[PDB]
């Protein structure tokens, strides 16, 4: 938990598959595990992790039905965690978990 | 617009009719129109208007399907405006409009 850092993914405004406008944010739980890769492979591993979290969130939710936002939160969180983890690995970072927090309907 | 005061209705956590948890807030647009009633009929006409806005919001949304939150926002706003206006009248206040702002799904 000590080296497990909390990242607040800035809010993402997109539309679901079934044409529903959603404002979504999330917390990323990530650990620095290869210092040499974190410091060599990218300029800034925090904001590198932030950027790809925002791009991924936008896409995963764009690719989602509203009913999945209601019923299948856990499944969506696993998709976010899978993808962001794959992304952060070249930078020596493990993503422990991803949790969608708020979901606003404007 | 000068005497039309903006009131931020504090967030209301409830469930829709079709069993959906919702966090909802709104702006109330209200005008003081009978000063004698505003000052006689109640201790504090702002917080009187706030309280009844929160109670009403909770009920109108409890009495709503999620699909009405998506599709029929305007209709829900008219219900809120009708009811809160009726409520504020004994206190010499006209409610110009009510607009649900944010709708969070926890
Ligand atoms: Na990773
Ligand atoms: Na009124």
mmCIF file with all atom_site columns, C-alpha atoms and ligand atoms in Angstrom:
data_model
loop_
_atom_site.group_PDB
_atom_site.id
_atom_site.type_symbol
_atom_site.label_atom_id
_atom_site.label_alt_id
_atom_site.label_comp_id
_atom_site.label_asym_id
_atom_site.label_entity_id
_atom_site.label_seq_id
_atom_site.pdbx_PDB_ins_code
_atom_site.Cartn_x
_atom_site.Cartn_y
_atom_site.Cartn_z
_atom_site.occupancy
_atom_site.B_iso_or_equiv
_atom_site.pdbx_formal_charge
_atom_site.auth_seq_id
_atom_site.auth_comp_id
_atom_site.auth_asym_id
_atom_site.auth_atom_id
_atom_site.pdbx_PDB_model_num
ATOM   1   C  CA  . UNK A 1 1   ? 0.000   0.000  0.000   1.00 0.00 ? 1   UNK A CA  1
ATOM   2   C  CA  . UNK A 1 2   ? 2.976   2.378  0.733   1.00 0.00 ? 2   UNK A CA  1
ATOM   3   C  CA  . UNK A 1 3   ? 4.355   2.316  -2.878  1.00 0.00 ? 3   UNK A CA  1
ATOM   4   C  CA  . UNK A 1 4   ? 0.742   1.943  -4.220  1.00 0.00 ? 4   UNK A CA  1
ATOM   5   C  CA  . UNK A 1 5   ? 0.027   5.519  -5.481  1.00 0.00 ? 5   UNK A CA  1
ATOM   6   C  CA  . UNK A 1 6   ? -3.545  6.882  -5.986  1.00 0.00 ? 6   UNK A CA  1
ATOM   7   C  CA  . UNK A 1 7   ? -4.068  8.786  -9.297  1.00 0.00 ? 7   UNK A CA  1
ATOM   8   C  CA  . UNK A 1 8   ? -7.312  10.828 -9.832  1.00 0.00 ? 8   UNK A CA  1
ATOM   9   C  CA  . UNK A 1 9   ? -8.074  10.485 -13.595 1.00 0.00 ? 9   UNK A CA  1
ATOM   10  C  CA  . UNK A 1 10  ? -9.416  13.892 -14.714 1.00 0.00 ? 10  UNK A CA  1
ATOM   11  C  CA  . UNK A 1 11  ? -13.084 13.852 -15.871 1.00 0.00 ? 11  UNK A CA  1
ATOM   12  C  CA  . UNK A 1 12  ? -13.808 12.486 -19.400 1.00 0.00 ? 12  UNK A CA  1
ATOM   13  C  CA  . UNK A 1 13  ? -16.902 13.732 -21.337 1.00 0.00 ? 13  UNK A CA  1
ATOM   14  C  CA  . UNK A 1 14  ? -18.037 11.180 -24.014 1.00 0.00 ? 14  UNK A CA  1
ATOM   15  C  CA  . UNK A 1 15  ? -21.155 9.268  -25.323 1.00 0.00 ? 15  UNK A CA  1
ATOM   16  C  CA  . UNK A 1 16  ? -22.042 5.579  -24.699 1.00 0.00 ? 16  UNK A CA  1
ATOM   17  C  CA  . UNK A 1 17  ? -22.710 3.131  -27.605 1.00 0.00 ? 17  UNK A CA  1
ATOM   18  C  CA  . UNK A 1 18  ? -26.537 3.591  -27.108 1.00 0.00 ? 18  UNK A CA  1
ATOM   19  C  CA  . UNK A 1 19  ? -26.088 7.433  -27.531 1.00 0.00 ? 19  UNK A CA  1
ATOM   20  C  CA  . UNK A 1 20  ? -25.950 8.534  -23.822 1.00 0.00 ? 20  UNK A CA  1
ATOM   21  C  CA  . UNK A 1 21  ? -23.767 11.525 -22.842 1.00 0.00 ? 21  UNK A CA  1
ATOM   22  C  CA  . UNK A 1 22  ? -21.662 10.580 -19.734 1.00 0.00 ? 22  UNK A CA  1
ATOM   23  C  CA  . UNK A 1 23  ? -19.093 12.527 -17.620 1.00 0.00 ? 23  UNK A CA  1
ATOM   24  C  CA  . UNK A 1 24  ? -16.804 9.832  -16.060 1.00 0.00 ? 24  UNK A CA  1
ATOM   25  C  CA  . UNK A 1 25  ? -13.714 9.898  -13.801 1.00 0.00 ? 25  UNK A CA  1
ATOM   26  C  CA  . UNK A 1 26  ? -11.763 7.126  -12.004 1.00 0.00 ? 26  UNK A CA  1
ATOM   27  C  CA  . UNK A 1 27  ? -8.957  6.399  -9.511  1.00 0.00 ? 27  UNK A CA  1
ATOM   28  C  CA  . UNK A 1 28  ? -5.923  4.457  -10.831 1.00 0.00 ? 28  UNK A CA  1
ATOM   29  C  CA  . UNK A 1 29  ? -4.006  2.374  -8.207  1.00 0.00 ? 29  UNK A CA  1
ATOM   30  C  CA  . UNK A 1 30  ? -0.445  1.917  -9.608  1.00 0.00 ? 30  UNK A CA  1
ATOM   31  C  CA  . UNK A 1 31  ? 2.960   0.803  -8.251  1.00 0.00 ? 31  UNK A CA  1
ATOM   32  C  CA  . UNK A 1 32  ? 6.451   1.720  -9.584  1.00 0.00 ? 32  UNK A CA  1
ATOM   33  C  CA  . UNK A 1 33  ? 8.134   -1.684 -9.985  1.00 0.00 ? 33  UNK A CA  1
ATOM   34  C  CA  . UNK A 1 34  ? 10.978  -1.067 -12.569 1.00 0.00 ? 34  UNK A CA  1
ATOM   35  C  CA  . UNK A 1 35  ? 12.662  2.269  -11.640 1.00 0.00 ? 35  UNK A CA  1
ATOM   36  C  CA  . UNK A 1 36  ? 15.099  2.093  -14.631 1.00 0.00 ? 36  UNK A CA  1
ATOM   37  C  CA  . UNK A 1 37  ? 12.169  1.746  -17.120 1.00 0.00 ? 37  UNK A CA  1
ATOM   38  C  CA  . UNK A 1 38  ? 9.994   4.399  -15.318 1.00 0.00 ? 38  UNK A CA  1
ATOM   39  C  CA  . UNK A 1 39  ? 12.900  6.904  -15.562 1.00 0.00 ? 39  UNK A CA  1
ATOM   40  C  CA  . UNK A 1 40  ? 14.268  5.884  -19.058 1.00 0.00 ? 40  UNK A CA  1
ATOM   41  C  CA  . UNK A 1 41  ? 11.212  4.893  -21.181 1.00 0.00 ? 41  UNK A CA  1
ATOM   42  C  CA  . UNK A 1 42  ? 9.183   8.139  -20.700 1.00 0.00 ? 42  UNK A CA  1
ATOM   43  C  CA  . UNK A 1 43  ? 9.592   11.779 -19.526 1.00 0.00 ? 43  UNK A CA  1
ATOM   44  C  CA  . UNK A 1 44  ? 7.150   11.581 -16.547 1.00 0.00 ? 44  UNK A CA  1
ATOM   45  C  CA  . UNK A 1 45  ? 5.644   8.244  -15.447 1.00 0.00 ? 45  UNK A CA  1
ATOM   46  C  CA  . UNK A 1 46  ? 2.776   9.837  -13.364 1.00 0.00 ? 46  UNK A CA  1
ATOM   47  C  CA  . UNK A 1 47  ? 1.410   11.986 -16.244 1.00 0.00 ? 47  UNK A CA  1
ATOM   48  C  CA  . UNK A 1 48  ? 2.256   9.236  -18.758 1.00 0.00 ? 48  UNK A CA  1
ATOM   49  C  CA  . UNK A 1 49  ? -0.059  6.995  -16.624 1.00 0.00 ? 49  UNK A CA  1
ATOM   50  C  CA  . UNK A 1 50  ? -2.644  9.847  -16.382 1.00 0.00 ? 50  UNK A CA  1
ATOM   51  C  CA  . UNK A 1 51  ? -2.767  10.512 -20.177 1.00 0.00 ? 51  UNK A CA  1
ATOM   52  C  CA  . UNK A 1 52  ? -3.269  6.819  -21.128 1.00 0.00 ? 52  UNK A CA  1
ATOM   53  C  CA  . UNK A 1 53  ? -5.864  6.454  -18.272 1.00 0.00 ? 53  UNK A CA  1
ATOM   54  C  CA  . UNK A 1 54  ? -7.921  9.319  -19.851 1.00 0.00 ? 54  UNK A CA  1
ATOM   55  C  CA  . UNK A 1 55  ? -7.610  8.009  -23.471 1.00 0.00 ? 55  UNK A CA  1
ATOM   56  C  CA  . UNK A 1 56  ? -8.497  4.448  -22.265 1.00 0.00 ? 56  UNK A CA  1
ATOM   57  C  CA  . UNK A 1 57  ? -11.399 5.565  -20.031 1.00 0.00 ? 57  UNK A CA  1
ATOM   58  C  CA  . UNK A 1 58  ? -12.878 7.576  -22.966 1.00 0.00 ? 58  UNK A CA  1
ATOM   59  C  CA  . UNK A 1 59  ? -12.680 4.510  -25.315 1.00 0.00 ? 59  UNK A CA  1
ATOM   60  C  CA  . UNK A 1 60  ? -13.818 1.837  -22.780 1.00 0.00 ? 60  UNK A CA  1
ATOM   61  C  CA  . UNK A 1 61  ? -16.926 3.944  -21.960 1.00 0.00 ? 61  UNK A CA  1
ATOM   62  C  CA  . UNK A 1 62  ? -17.515 4.954  -25.620 1.00 0.00 ? 62  UNK A CA  1
ATOM   63  C  CA  . UNK A 1 63  ? -17.495 1.145  -26.252 1.00 0.00 ? 63  UNK A CA  1
ATOM   64  C  CA  . UNK A 1 64  ? -19.968 0.591  -23.350 1.00 0.00 ? 64  UNK A CA  1
ATOM   65  C  CA  . UNK A 1 65  ? -23.800 0.569  -23.102 1.00 0.00 ? 65  UNK A CA  1
ATOM   66  C  CA  . UNK A 1 66  ? -25.291 2.653  -20.237 1.00 0.00 ? 66  UNK A CA  1
ATOM   67  C  CA  . UNK A 1 67  ? -26.692 -0.644 -18.784 1.00 0.00 ? 67  UNK A CA  1
ATOM   68  C  CA  . UNK A 1 68  ? -23.040 -1.815 -18.341 1.00 0.00 ? 68  UNK A CA  1
ATOM   69  C  CA  . UNK A 1 69  ? -22.364 1.454  -16.373 1.00 0.00 ? 69  UNK A CA  1
ATOM   70  C  CA  . UNK A 1 70  ? -25.368 0.477  -14.125 1.00 0.00 ? 70  UNK A CA  1
ATOM   71  C  CA  . UNK A 1 71  ? -25.101 -3.363 -13.836 1.00 0.00 ? 71  UNK A CA  1
ATOM   72  C  CA  . UNK A 1 72  ? -21.528 -4.324 -14.870 1.00 0.00 ? 72  UNK A CA  1
ATOM   73  C  CA  . UNK A 1 73  ? -19.302 -1.693 -13.119 1.00 0.00 ? 73  UNK A CA  1
ATOM   74  C  CA  . UNK A 1 74  ? -16.848 -4.430 -11.922 1.00 0.00 ? 74  UNK A CA  1
ATOM   75  C  CA  . UNK A 1 75  ? -16.483 -5.797 -15.511 1.00 0.00 ? 75  UNK A CA  1
ATOM   76  C  CA  . UNK A 1 76  ? -15.712 -2.236 -16.814 1.00 0.00 ? 76  UNK A CA  1
ATOM   77  C  CA  . UNK A 1 77  ? -13.150 -1.697 -13.983 1.00 0.00 ? 77  UNK A CA  1
ATOM   78  C  CA  . UNK A 1 78  ? -11.403 -5.011 -15.001 1.00 0.00 ? 78  UNK A CA  1
ATOM   79  C  CA  . UNK A 1 79  ? -11.270 -3.760 -18.655 1.00 0.00 ? 79  UNK A CA  1
ATOM   80  C  CA  . UNK A 1 80  ? -9.738  -0.406 -17.542 1.00 0.00 ? 80  UNK A CA  1
ATOM   81  C  CA  . UNK A 1 81  ? -7.225  -2.224 -15.215 1.00 0.00 ? 81  UNK A CA  1
ATOM   82  C  CA  . UNK A 1 82  ? -6.279  -4.744 -17.979 1.00 0.00 ? 82  UNK A CA  1
ATOM   83  C  CA  . UNK A 1 83  ? -5.639  -2.087 -20.657 1.00 0.00 ? 83  UNK A CA  1
ATOM   84  C  CA  . UNK A 1 84  ? -3.913  0.580  -18.496 1.00 0.00 ? 84  UNK A CA  1
ATOM   85  C  CA  . UNK A 1 85  ? -1.751  -2.151 -16.914 1.00 0.00 ? 85  UNK A CA  1
ATOM   86  C  CA  . UNK A 1 86  ? -0.622  -3.353 -20.382 1.00 0.00 ? 86  UNK A CA  1
ATOM   87  C  CA  . UNK A 1 87  ? 0.097   0.344  -21.238 1.00 0.00 ? 87  UNK A CA  1
ATOM   88  C  CA  . UNK A 1 88  ? 2.133   1.200  -18.046 1.00 0.00 ? 88  UNK A CA  1
ATOM   89  C  CA  . UNK A 1 89  ? 4.317   -1.979 -18.266 1.00 0.00 ? 89  UNK A CA  1
ATOM   90  C  CA  . UNK A 1 90  ? 6.827   -0.546 -20.802 1.00 0.00 ? 90  UNK A CA  1
ATOM   91  C  CA  . UNK A 1 91  ? 7.367   2.256  -18.142 1.00 0.00 ? 91  UNK A CA  1
ATOM   92  C  CA  . UNK A 1 92  ? 8.039   -0.158 -15.221 1.00 0.00 ? 92  UNK A CA  1
ATOM   93  C  CA  . UNK A 1 93  ? 4.607   0.468  -13.593 1.00 0.00 ? 93  UNK A CA  1
ATOM   94  C  CA  . UNK A 1 94  ? 2.033   -2.131 -12.411 1.00 0.00 ? 94  UNK A CA  1
ATOM   95  C  CA  . UNK A 1 95  ? -1.620  -0.917 -12.197 1.00 0.00 ? 95  UNK A CA  1
ATOM   96  C  CA  . UNK A 1 96  ? -3.024  -2.681 -9.044  1.00 0.00 ? 96  UNK A CA  1
ATOM   97  C  CA  . UNK A 1 97  ? -6.664  -1.620 -9.799  1.00 0.00 ? 97  UNK A CA  1
ATOM   98  C  CA  . UNK A 1 98  ? -8.860  0.915  -11.695 1.00 0.00 ? 98  UNK A CA  1
ATOM   99  C  CA  . UNK A 1 99  ? -12.232 2.066  -10.211 1.00 0.00 ? 99  UNK A CA  1
ATOM   100 C  CA  . UNK A 1 100 ? -14.671 4.343  -12.081 1.00 0.00 ? 100 UNK A CA  1
ATOM   101 C  CA  . UNK A 1 101 ? -15.840 6.778  -9.341  1.00 0.00 ? 101 UNK A CA  1
ATOM   102 C  CA  . UNK A 1 102 ? -18.532 9.272  -10.466 1.00 0.00 ? 102 UNK A CA  1
ATOM   103 C  CA  . UNK A 1 103 ? -20.747 8.902  -13.603 1.00 0.00 ? 103 UNK A CA  1
ATOM   104 C  CA  . UNK A 1 104 ? -22.659 12.162 -14.380 1.00 0.00 ? 104 UNK A CA  1
ATOM   105 C  CA  . UNK A 1 105 ? -25.435 12.336 -17.043 1.00 0.00 ? 105 UNK A CA  1
ATOM   106 C  CA  . UNK A 1 106 ? -25.501 15.984 -18.320 1.00 0.00 ? 106 UNK A CA  1
ATOM   107 C  CA  . UNK B 2 1   ? -32.998 38.874 -13.490 1.00 0.00 ? 1   UNK B CA  1
ATOM   108 C  CA  . UNK B 2 2   ? -31.738 41.301 -10.738 1.00 0.00 ? 2   UNK B CA  1
ATOM   109 C  CA  . UNK B 2 3   ? -34.240 40.090 -8.050  1.00 0.00 ? 3   UNK B CA  1
ATOM   110 C  CA  . UNK B 2 4   ? -34.095 36.528 -9.562  1.00 0.00 ? 4   UNK B CA  1
ATOM   111 C  CA  . UNK B 2 5   ? -31.826 34.716 -7.022  1.00 0.00 ? 5   UNK B CA  1
ATOM   112 C  CA  . UNK B 2 6   ? -29.901 31.484 -7.873  1.00 0.00 ? 6   UNK B CA  1
ATOM   113 C  CA  . UNK B 2 7   ? -30.112 28.748 -5.166  1.00 0.00 ? 7   UNK B CA  1
ATOM   114 C  CA  . UNK B 2 8   ? -27.791 25.659 -5.390  1.00 0.00 ? 8   UNK B CA  1
ATOM   115 C  CA  . UNK B 2 9   ? -29.894 22.750 -3.985  1.00 0.00 ? 9   UNK B CA  1
ATOM   116 C  CA  . UNK B 2 10  ? -27.472 20.569 -1.977  1.00 0.00 ? 10  UNK B CA  1
ATOM   117 C  CA  . UNK B 2 11  ? -26.952 17.038 -3.410  1.00 0.00 ? 11  UNK B CA  1
ATOM   118 C  CA  . UNK B 2 12  ? -29.721 14.441 -2.757  1.00 0.00 ? 12  UNK B CA  1
ATOM   119 C  CA  . UNK B 2 13  ? -28.838 10.689 -2.637  1.00 0.00 ? 13  UNK B CA  1
ATOM   120 C  CA  . UNK B 2 14  ? -31.908 8.470  -3.421  1.00 0.00 ? 14  UNK B CA  1
ATOM   121 C  CA  . UNK B 2 15  ? -33.084 5.511  -5.646  1.00 0.00 ? 15  UNK B CA  1
ATOM   122 C  CA  . UNK B 2 16  ? -35.273 5.710  -8.802  1.00 0.00 ? 16  UNK B CA  1
ATOM   123 C  CA  . UNK B 2 17  ? -38.543 3.691  -9.135  1.00 0.00 ? 17  UNK B CA  1
ATOM   124 C  CA  . UNK B 2 18  ? -36.671 1.014  -11.241 1.00 0.00 ? 18  UNK B CA  1
ATOM   125 C  CA  . UNK B 2 19  ? -34.111 0.586  -8.342  1.00 0.00 ? 19  UNK B CA  1
ATOM   126 C  CA  . UNK B 2 20  ? -31.253 2.882  -9.586  1.00 0.00 ? 20  UNK B CA  1
ATOM   127 C  CA  . UNK B 2 21  ? -29.130 4.777  -7.022  1.00 0.00 ? 21  UNK B CA  1
ATOM   128 C  CA  . UNK B 2 22  ? -28.812 8.470  -8.137  1.00 0.00 ? 22  UNK B CA  1
ATOM   129 C  CA  . UNK B 2 23  ? -26.983 11.512 -6.631  1.00 0.00 ? 23  UNK B CA  1
ATOM   130 C  CA  . UNK B 2 24  ? -28.924 14.601 -7.906  1.00 0.00 ? 24  UNK B CA  1
ATOM   131 C  CA  . UNK B 2 25  ? -28.624 18.380 -7.375  1.00 0.00 ? 25  UNK B CA  1
ATOM   132 C  CA  . UNK B 2 26  ? -30.384 21.371 -9.014  1.00 0.00 ? 26  UNK B CA  1
ATOM   133 C  CA  . UNK B 2 27  ? -30.468 25.185 -9.268  1.00 0.00 ? 27  UNK B CA  1
ATOM   134 C  CA  . UNK B 2 28  ? -33.674 26.932 -8.089  1.00 0.00 ? 28  UNK B CA  1
ATOM   135 C  CA  . UNK B 2 29  ? -34.435 30.326 -9.761  1.00 0.00 ? 29  UNK B CA  1
ATOM   136 C  CA  . UNK B 2 30  ? -36.721 32.229 -7.312  1.00 0.00 ? 30  UNK B CA  1
ATOM   137 C  CA  . UNK B 2 31  ? -37.928 35.837 -6.859  1.00 0.00 ? 31  UNK B CA  1
ATOM   138 C  CA  . UNK B 2 32  ? -39.101 37.549 -3.620  1.00 0.00 ? 32  UNK B CA  1
ATOM   139 C  CA  . UNK B 2 33  ? -42.476 39.033 -4.612  1.00 0.00 ? 33  UNK B CA  1
ATOM   140 C  CA  . UNK B 2 34  ? -44.364 39.501 -1.240  1.00 0.00 ? 34  UNK B CA  1
ATOM   141 C  CA  . UNK B 2 35  ? -41.842 40.936 1.292   1.00 0.00 ? 35  UNK B CA  1
ATOM   142 C  CA  . UNK B 2 36  ? -44.430 40.940 4.157   1.00 0.00 ? 36  UNK B CA  1
ATOM   143 C  CA  . UNK B 2 37  ? -45.125 37.176 3.664   1.00 0.00 ? 37  UNK B CA  1
ATOM   144 C  CA  . UNK B 2 38  ? -41.386 36.297 3.149   1.00 0.00 ? 38  UNK B CA  1
ATOM   145 C  CA  . UNK B 2 39  ? -40.549 38.037 6.473   1.00 0.00 ? 39  UNK B CA  1
ATOM   146 C  CA  . UNK B 2 40  ? -43.716 37.017 8.489   1.00 0.00 ? 40  UNK B CA  1
ATOM   147 C  CA  . UNK B 2 41  ? -44.659 33.471 7.321   1.00 0.00 ? 41  UNK B CA  1
ATOM   148 C  CA  . UNK B 2 42  ? -41.248 31.793 7.977   1.00 0.00 ? 42  UNK B CA  1
ATOM   149 C  CA  . UNK B 2 43  ? -37.943 32.366 9.860   1.00 0.00 ? 43  UNK B CA  1
ATOM   150 C  CA  . UNK B 2 44  ? -35.647 32.400 6.761   1.00 0.00 ? 44  UNK B CA  1
ATOM   151 C  CA  . UNK B 2 45  ? -37.100 32.379 3.225   1.00 0.00 ? 45  UNK B CA  1
ATOM   152 C  CA  . UNK B 2 46  ? -33.791 31.287 1.505   1.00 0.00 ? 46  UNK B CA  1
ATOM   153 C  CA  . UNK B 2 47  ? -33.301 28.143 3.665   1.00 0.00 ? 47  UNK B CA  1
ATOM   154 C  CA  . UNK B 2 48  ? -37.077 27.570 3.768   1.00 0.00 ? 48  UNK B CA  1
ATOM   155 C  CA  . UNK B 2 49  ? -36.855 27.437 -0.088  1.00 0.00 ? 49  UNK B CA  1
ATOM   156 C  CA  . UNK B 2 50  ? -33.696 25.235 0.141   1.00 0.00 ? 50  UNK B CA  1
ATOM   157 C  CA  . UNK B 2 51  ? -35.255 22.663 2.553   1.00 0.00 ? 51  UNK B CA  1
ATOM   158 C  CA  . UNK B 2 52  ? -38.446 22.166 0.464   1.00 0.00 ? 52  UNK B CA  1
ATOM   159 C  CA  . UNK B 2 53  ? -36.296 22.027 -2.757  1.00 0.00 ? 53  UNK B CA  1
ATOM   160 C  CA  . UNK B 2 54  ? -34.311 19.081 -1.237  1.00 0.00 ? 54  UNK B CA  1
ATOM   161 C  CA  . UNK B 2 55  ? -37.425 17.211 0.077   1.00 0.00 ? 55  UNK B CA  1
ATOM   162 C  CA  . UNK B 2 56  ? -39.193 17.761 -3.315  1.00 0.00 ? 56  UNK B CA  1
ATOM   163 C  CA  . UNK B 2 57  ? -36.153 16.799 -5.435  1.00 0.00 ? 57  UNK B CA  1
ATOM   164 C  CA  . UNK B 2 58  ? -35.763 13.553 -3.396  1.00 0.00 ? 58  UNK B CA  1
ATOM   165 C  CA  . UNK B 2 59  ? -39.479 12.629 -3.942  1.00 0.00 ? 59  UNK B CA  1
ATOM   166 C  CA  . UNK B 2 60  ? -39.746 13.707 -7.634  1.00 0.00 ? 60  UNK B CA  1
ATOM   167 C  CA  . UNK B 2 61  ? -36.668 11.567 -8.478  1.00 0.00 ? 61  UNK B CA  1
ATOM   168 C  CA  . UNK B 2 62  ? -37.735 8.678  -6.181  1.00 0.00 ? 62  UNK B CA  1
ATOM   169 C  CA  . UNK B 2 63  ? -41.008 8.796  -8.225  1.00 0.00 ? 63  UNK B CA  1
ATOM   170 C  CA  . UNK B 2 64  ? -39.017 8.804  -11.524 1.00 0.00 ? 64  UNK B CA  1
ATOM   171 C  CA  . UNK B 2 65  ? -37.650 6.030  -13.800 1.00 0.00 ? 65  UNK B CA  1
ATOM   172 C  CA  . UNK B 2 66  ? -33.979 6.419  -14.871 1.00 0.00 ? 66  UNK B CA  1
ATOM   173 C  CA  . UNK B 2 67  ? -35.240 6.696  -18.515 1.00 0.00 ? 67  UNK B CA  1
ATOM   174 C  CA  . UNK B 2 68  ? -37.078 9.924  -17.466 1.00 0.00 ? 68  UNK B CA  1
ATOM   175 C  CA  . UNK B 2 69  ? -33.703 11.251 -16.100 1.00 0.00 ? 69  UNK B CA  1
ATOM   176 C  CA  . UNK B 2 70  ? -32.225 10.496 -19.604 1.00 0.00 ? 70  UNK B CA  1
ATOM   177 C  CA  . UNK B 2 71  ? -35.091 11.389 -22.031 1.00 0.00 ? 71  UNK B CA  1
ATOM   178 C  CA  . UNK B 2 72  ? -37.563 13.599 -20.091 1.00 0.00 ? 72  UNK B CA  1
ATOM   179 C  CA  . UNK B 2 73  ? -35.301 16.059 -18.149 1.00 0.00 ? 73  UNK B CA  1
ATOM   180 C  CA  . UNK B 2 74  ? -37.529 19.052 -19.161 1.00 0.00 ? 74  UNK B CA  1
ATOM   181 C  CA  . UNK B 2 75  ? -40.687 17.251 -17.870 1.00 0.00 ? 75  UNK B CA  1
ATOM   182 C  CA  . UNK B 2 76  ? -38.935 16.551 -14.491 1.00 0.00 ? 76  UNK B CA  1
ATOM   183 C  CA  . UNK B 2 77  ? -37.784 20.224 -14.266 1.00 0.00 ? 77  UNK B CA  1
ATOM   184 C  CA  . UNK B 2 78  ? -41.454 21.357 -14.831 1.00 0.00 ? 78  UNK B CA  1
ATOM   185 C  CA  . UNK B 2 79  ? -42.569 18.993 -11.985 1.00 0.00 ? 79  UNK B CA  1
ATOM   186 C  CA  . UNK B 2 80  ? -39.882 20.425 -9.626  1.00 0.00 ? 80  UNK B CA  1
ATOM   187 C  CA  . UNK B 2 81  ? -40.799 24.053 -10.639 1.00 0.00 ? 81  UNK B CA  1
ATOM   188 C  CA  . UNK B 2 82  ? -44.570 23.368 -10.200 1.00 0.00 ? 82  UNK B CA  1
ATOM   189 C  CA  . UNK B 2 83  ? -44.231 21.821 -6.717  1.00 0.00 ? 83  UNK B CA  1
ATOM   190 C  CA  . UNK B 2 84  ? -41.551 24.152 -5.253  1.00 0.00 ? 84  UNK B CA  1
ATOM   191 C  CA  . UNK B 2 85  ? -43.467 27.164 -6.631  1.00 0.00 ? 85  UNK B CA  1
ATOM   192 C  CA  . UNK B 2 86  ? -46.679 26.001 -4.878  1.00 0.00 ? 86  UNK B CA  1
ATOM   193 C  CA  . UNK B 2 87  ? -44.559 25.526 -1.685  1.00 0.00 ? 87  UNK B CA  1
ATOM   194 C  CA  . UNK B 2 88  ? -42.793 28.982 -1.749  1.00 0.00 ? 88  UNK B CA  1
ATOM   195 C  CA  . UNK B 2 89  ? -46.059 30.934 -2.420  1.00 0.00 ? 89  UNK B CA  1
ATOM   196 C  CA  . UNK B 2 90  ? -47.186 31.069 1.255   1.00 0.00 ? 90  UNK B CA  1
ATOM   197 C  CA  . UNK B 2 91  ? -43.740 32.789 1.875   1.00 0.00 ? 91  UNK B CA  1
ATOM   198 C  CA  . UNK B 2 92  ? -44.185 35.461 -0.859  1.00 0.00 ? 92  UNK B CA  1
ATOM   199 C  CA  . UNK B 2 93  ? -41.685 33.778 -3.255  1.00 0.00 ? 93  UNK B CA  1
ATOM   200 C  CA  . UNK B 2 94  ? -42.182 32.893 -6.963  1.00 0.00 ? 94  UNK B CA  1
ATOM   201 C  CA  . UNK B 2 95  ? -39.945 30.072 -8.344  1.00 0.00 ? 95  UNK B CA  1
ATOM   202 C  CA  . UNK B 2 96  ? -39.088 31.216 -11.946 1.00 0.00 ? 96  UNK B CA  1
ATOM   203 C  CA  . UNK B 2 97  ? -37.512 27.815 -12.889 1.00 0.00 ? 97  UNK B CA  1
ATOM   204 C  CA  . UNK B 2 98  ? -35.909 24.606 -11.482 1.00 0.00 ? 98  UNK B CA  1
ATOM   205 C  CA  . UNK B 2 99  ? -33.108 22.808 -13.434 1.00 0.00 ? 99  UNK B CA  1
ATOM   206 C  CA  . UNK B 2 100 ? -31.610 19.463 -12.339 1.00 0.00 ? 100 UNK B CA  1
ATOM   207 C  CA  . UNK B 2 101 ? -27.845 19.973 -12.943 1.00 0.00 ? 101 UNK B CA  1
ATOM   208 C  CA  . UNK B 2 102 ? -25.685 16.876 -12.256 1.00 0.00 ? 102 UNK B CA  1
ATOM   209 C  CA  . UNK B 2 103 ? -26.990 13.253 -12.015 1.00 0.00 ? 103 UNK B CA  1
ATOM   210 C  CA  . UNK B 2 104 ? -24.304 10.871 -10.602 1.00 0.00 ? 104 UNK B CA  1
ATOM   211 C  CA  . UNK B 2 105 ? -24.746 7.045  -10.587 1.00 0.00 ? 105 UNK B CA  1
ATOM   212 C  CA  . UNK B 2 106 ? -22.642 5.710  -7.633  1.00 0.00 ? 106 UNK B CA  1
HETATM 213 NA NA1 . LIG C 3 .   ? 1.432   -1.971 -16.183 1.00 0.00 ? 1   LIG C NA1 1
HETATM 214 NA NA1 . LIG C 3 .   ? -43.958 30.037 -5.148  1.00 0.00 ? 2   LIG C NA1 1
#
